[PDB]
Design a protein around this ligand. Structure first.
Ligand SMILES: Nc1ncnc2c1ncn2[C@@H]1O[C@H](COP(=O)(O)CP(=O)(O)OP(=O)(O)O)[C@@H](O)[C@H]1O
Ligand SMILES: Nc1ncnc2c1ncn2[C@@H]1O[C@H](COP(=O)(O)CP(=O)(O)OP(=O)(O)O)[C@@H](O)[C@H]1O
Ligand SMILES: C[C@]12CC[C@@H]3c4cc(O)c(O)cc4CC[C@H]3[C@@H]1CC[C@@H]2O
Ligand SMILES: C[C@]12CC[C@@H]3c4cc(O)c(O)cc4CC[C@H]3[C@@H]1CC[C@@H]2O
Ligand SMILES: [Ca+2]
Ligand SMILES: [Ca+2]
Ligand SMILES: [Mg+2]
Ligand SMILES: [Mg+2]
Lengths: 198, 193
């Protein structure tokens, strides 16, 4: 027995390392693999400490859900998604320092690691998909695509969110408001780059 | 499996315009179609000794040459066989869906990309939640090839085509693959022998 996935208001945080490919070539398998595992370990810790749920890892990208499976208020979803994003950036510093003092970065034209983060709140079909084995709890829908594309539209080490997220964010933490057209998304989105600090 | 360097073949499948038919299937239709589709597709990969890495919406990632070793030529054969069987199964799925109201009221079609190359294969993530997957440019290439090919067609890189019988190559064209600075040699293969 299972539960039919259904529409639920959730918040999605999409993080993605900037140009991982280029360093996956500069560094070596063992280096790449270890840098990734440390990165993924720290980032997920951040998500977990903020009551978030790591939906999955898609390479060097992370998809975190807030409001599923555990219920969570709209404002709370956002507060935690942002706290998570801001906490990931602080952990990125320590990681780089460490990857620096090891040669994984800051040497051999391998710039220190940077990532993009997008946060969006909207409706999405959430639940178990696939088949009674390779079945997994995930979110399906346009809302998800918007988060991923906001991420690809923001500068390195910056956090971009949609208007639906910014409404719970203080004005003083808003760096820039923009009206962008995201790929695969017909209607333009009102976005805001938020301060990586509170 | 410990993250190690390895030559593998990556198969990337994706349904065309799944969203465009979302608010028509409703949450219930999306679920049933996706579940049925995923089941069959995963079967195709299974019957061909492939390893299902993960689903990403209506997209599927399969690996050949890991965890179990497999020769370069074998990888391509199994991968191409999987892709072809996928279309066949797609016929039947569409049939059933057809005489059901779900689709054809457009019918489901998908793209498939295939690339062979080095990649770090093994368990990544955390010492809580980790998953068997592949890392490296090769995955991007497979997915990008998947996005550039026409619906219900299989597109591969030159590294894969080098094992395919020439007569089965429907088209050779240099295309732009996002993330790849230089245009790549793409090969559309016959969906049949
Ligand atoms: N298991 C997996 N599933 C999907 N992609 C994977 C993967 N493992 C590794 N990848 C890889 O992760 C990399 C993503 O490419 P990047 O160099 O980081 C581009 P980017 O800087 O994020 O720019 P962009 O997102 O604006 O396009 C590719 O090398 C891709 O092949
Ligand atoms: N777990 C997940 N992670 C990321 N995206 C997900 C997802 N689950 C579902 N999706 C969604 O799955 C849908 C797939 O989009 P499609 O309309 O089929 C694009 P397409 O027709 O394949 O064109 P394209 O691949 O050439 O860009 C979107 O609604 C996307 O947001
Ligand atoms: C194609 C997609 C938008 C880009 C999303 C992405 C972007 C990115 O820059 C990454 O490094 C990784 C991902 C993984 C999921 C992708 C999504 C699947 C449905 C949607 O149409
Ligand atoms: C951004 C990406 C290429 C597109 C790949 C994709 C495409 C698509 O059309 C889908 O429906 C789903 C996916 C999931 C993984 C994506 C890959 C992650 C690394 C690489 O840079
Ligand atoms: Ca990346
Ligand atoms: Ca799709
Ligand atoms: Mg990316
Ligand atoms: Mg797609």
């Amino acid at each position: 027995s299972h539960m039919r996935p259904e529409p639920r208001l959730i918040t999605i945080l999409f993080s993605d390392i900037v140009g991982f490919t280029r360093m996956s070539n500069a560094l070596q398998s063992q280096g790449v693999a270890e840098l990734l595992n440390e990165y993924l370990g720290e980032m997920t810790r951040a998500v977990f400490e903020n009551q978030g749920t790591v939906d999955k890892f898609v390479g060097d990208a992370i998809m975190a859900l807030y409001g599923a499976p555990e219920e969570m208020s709209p404002s709370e979803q956002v507060r935690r998604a942002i706290a998570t994003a801001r906490q990931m950036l602080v952990a990125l510093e320590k990681l780089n320092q460490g990857w620096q003092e090891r040669g994984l970065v800051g040497r051999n034209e391998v710039p220190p690691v940077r990532f993009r983060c997008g946060i969006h709140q909207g409706m999405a079909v959430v639940g178990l998909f696939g088949s009674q084995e390779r079945s997994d709890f995930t979110a399906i829908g346009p809302s998800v695509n918007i988060a991923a594309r906001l991420q690809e539209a923001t500068a390195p080490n910056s956090i971009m969110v949609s208007a639906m997220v910014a409404q719970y964010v203080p004005d003083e933490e808003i760096i820039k408001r923009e009206f962008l057209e995201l790929k695969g998304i017909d209607e333009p989105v009102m976005t805001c780059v938020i301060n990586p600090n509170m």
